[PDB]
């Protein structure tokens, strides 16, 4: 039942909604969910393409914007920023009630900037300013350029959602870049206590990529095993003396965010990823249908840290079979950028 969302909160995990649309906000639905266990919102270009195509409340906004001398991209941004700002205002009470630790809404920069650190910084700074809300995060793909940009944006005091992570190595590089940005601010005597960063580490896409050629003992196991090991990396990084010195001065840890947590194979229980990845100081962003399933028949237990030994043994067998999870991760990141760019192009065409 719905109290499962407060049980998960008590176990230390935030549940966010992996969807956004004009009607979600205008109807009052988002506000009601913020009172009843949902703590934040994520978007991406695929989510906006579907929203723009399906939600009748955009039609008049598009008609209005087609009266103006604006590029399709700016028409998109006007729409998307307005949805995000409004969602931020819905989430603000929640955000303030936790000292700015929850209640965030994420907006992604243009996918075509993904390998351009400067351009990414410039767009992220602009979108942060355009939204004009303390509880907005700018979402940036975790390419090498993205991690360069992360360090700059953190040093600028901007909260960031680093996305399309599939790699423990690339996640650790992101933590080190965050720590450099924080340290720069502390040395400059600047505030860091409200800067928040999440690392959106994708789940179902790993299983989708591998399962058809894995032996049955490993099917549906790899993504969770990778996440479990990533969380152990996280504990080790952030408890080390180097970070503890920053946290003592008010720095926030980055938090892992489980993304792509809808189940994509009907052979697996639809609550598999939410049920399996609950642990303290994490986020899980879930699509509507998965939130529904979790409320109906999910389980709230501290599962993320259970059976780490077996996670590691399975990752050892994945390697034994010849699957290089770093190669896989890079491929998945590149495919995810291509797909987001496809979605973005599809969104823009009706705005010409």
196 is a site residue for Cl ion (CB under 5 A): no
The 3-class secondary structure across 74-135, one letter per residue, is: HHHHHHHHHHHHHHHHHHHHHHHHCCCCCCCEEEECCHHHCCCHHHHHHHHHHHHHHHCCCC
From residue 285, how far is each of 26, 209, 342 by CA, in Å? Answer: 21, 21, 22
- Measured distance CA(146)–CA(304) in Å, rounded: 27
Q: Which of 192, 208, 194, 214 is nearest to 336 (CA)?
A: 208
Tokens of 15: 């549940």
Nearer to Cl ion, 163 or 204 (CB): 163
Closer of 16 and 243 to Cl ion (Cβ): 16
Q: Is 110 in the site for Cl ion (CB under 5 A)?
A: no
C-beta of 61 vs 112, nearer to Cl ion: 112
Name the helix (H) or strand (E) containing 138.
strand 136-141
Which 204-223 positions form the footprint of Cl ion (CB under 5 A)?
Answer: none
Say whether residue 163 binds Cl ion (CB under 5 A).
yes
- Verify binding: residue 106, Cl ion, rule CB under 5 A: no
**In the complex, minimum distance from the CB of residue 202 to Cl ion, in angstroms, rounded to a whole number:** 8
- Residue number with CB closer to Cl ion (184 or 346): 346
Q: Are 298 and 13 in contact (CB under 8 A)?
A: no
- Candidate ranges 41-49, 56-64, 80-88, 218-226; the one touching Cl ion (CB under 5 A): 41-49
Is 50 a catalytic site residue? no
Q: How big is the site for Cl ion, counted in residues (CB under 5 A)?
A: 2
Give the interface segment with Cl ion, choosing from 60-68, 156-164, 173-181, 237-245 (CB under 5 A): 156-164
- The Cα–Cα gap between 19 and 42 comes to 6
Contacts of 164 (CB under 8 A, 6+ apart): 141, 142, 143, 200, 202, 332, 333, 336, 337
Q: How far is the CB of 21 from Cl ion (least distance, A)?
A: 16
Stretch that binds Cl ion, among 22-30, 158-166, 268-276, 293-301 (CB under 5 A): 158-166
Binding window for Cl ion (CB under 5 A); candidates: 14-22, 40-48, 130-138, 229-237: 40-48
Can residue 271 be called a binding residue for Cl ion (CB under 5 A)?
no
Q: Give 119 or 287: the residue with its C-beta nearer to Cl ion.
A: 287
Rounded distance, CA 104 to CA 110, Å? Answer: 20
Q: Nearest approach, Cβ of 28 to Cl ion (angstroms)?
A: 26
Q: Out of 115, 139, 173, 221, which one is annotated catalytic?
A: 139
Query: Shortest Cβ distance from residue 195 to Cl ion (Å)?
Result: 20
- Are the beta carbons of 25 and 87 closer than 8 angstroms? yes
Per rule CB under 5 A, is residue 333 in the interface with Cl ion? no
Q: Does position 44 bind Cl ion by CB under 5 A? A: yes
Contacts 24+ apart (CB under 8 A), 71-75: 72/348, 72/349, 72/351, 72/352, 73/110, 73/348, 75/351
User: Rounded to the nearest whole angstrom, what is the least distance from the CB of residue 18 to Cl ion in the complex?
Assistant: 8
Which neighbouring-strand residues pair with 259? 202
Q: For residues 222 and 261, which CB has a smaller minimum distance to Cl ion in the complex?
A: 261
- In this chain, which stretch among 123-131, 161-169, 307-315, 343-351 interacts with Cl ion, using CB under 5 A? 161-169
Helices 117-131 and 72-97, axial angle in degrees (round to 10): 60
Residue placing its CB nearer to Cl ion in the complex, 86 or 203: 203
Q: Which residue is nearest to Cl ion (CB)?
A: 44
Rule CB under 5 A: say whether 120 interacts with Cl ion: no
Q: Which residues bind to Cl ion, rule: CB under 5 A? A: 44, 163
Active site residues: 139
């Amino acid at each position: 039942g719905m109290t499962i969302l407060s049980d998960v909160k008590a176990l230390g995990q935030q549940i966010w909604l992996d969807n956004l649309s004009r009607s979600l906000v205008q109807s009052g639905e988002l506000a009601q969910m913020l009172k009843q266990g949902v703590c934040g919102v994520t978007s991406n270009p695929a989510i906006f393409q579907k929203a723009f195509a399906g939600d009748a409340l955009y039609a008049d906004e598009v008609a209005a914007l087609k009266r103006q001398n604006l590029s399709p991209k700016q028409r998109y941004e006007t729409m998307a920023v307005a949805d995000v700002r409004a969602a931020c205002d819905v989430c603000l009470a929640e955000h303030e009630s936790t000292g700015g630790k929850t209640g965030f809404v994420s907006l992604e920069v243009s996918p075509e900037l993904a390998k351009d650190a400067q351009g990414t910084v410039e767009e992220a700074r602009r979108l942060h300013a355009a939204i004009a809300r303390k509880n907005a995060m700018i979402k940036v793909p975790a390419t090498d350029a993205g991690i360069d940009a992360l360090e700059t944006l953190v040093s600028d005091g901007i909260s960031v959602n680093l996305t399309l992570l599939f790699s423990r190595a690339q996640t650790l590089k992101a933590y080190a870049a965050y720590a450099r940005g924080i340290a720069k601010r502390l040395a400059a005597g600047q505030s860091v206590a409200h800067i928040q960063v999440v690392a959106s580490f994708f789940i179902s896409r790993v299983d989708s990529a591998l399962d058809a050629t894995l032996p049955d003992r490993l099917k549906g196991k790899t993504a969770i095993a990778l996440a479990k090991a990533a969380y152990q990396d996280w504990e080790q990084y952030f408890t080390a003396p180097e970070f503890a010195a920053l946290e003592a001065q008010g720095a926030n840890r980055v938090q892992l965010l489980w993304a792509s947590t809808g189940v994509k194979n009907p052979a697996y229980p639809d609550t598999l990823y939410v049920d399996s990845l609950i642990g303290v100081h994490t986020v899980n962003t879930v699509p509507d249908a998965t939130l529904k399933a979790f409320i109906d028949h999910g389980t709230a237990k501290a599962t993320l840290t259970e059976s780490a030994d077996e996670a590691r043994a399975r990752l050892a067998e994945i390697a034994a079979l010849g699957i290089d999870v770093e190669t896989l991760a890079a491929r998945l990141q590149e495919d995810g950028l291509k797909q987001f760019e496809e979605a973005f192009e599809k969104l823009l065409a009706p705005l010409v």
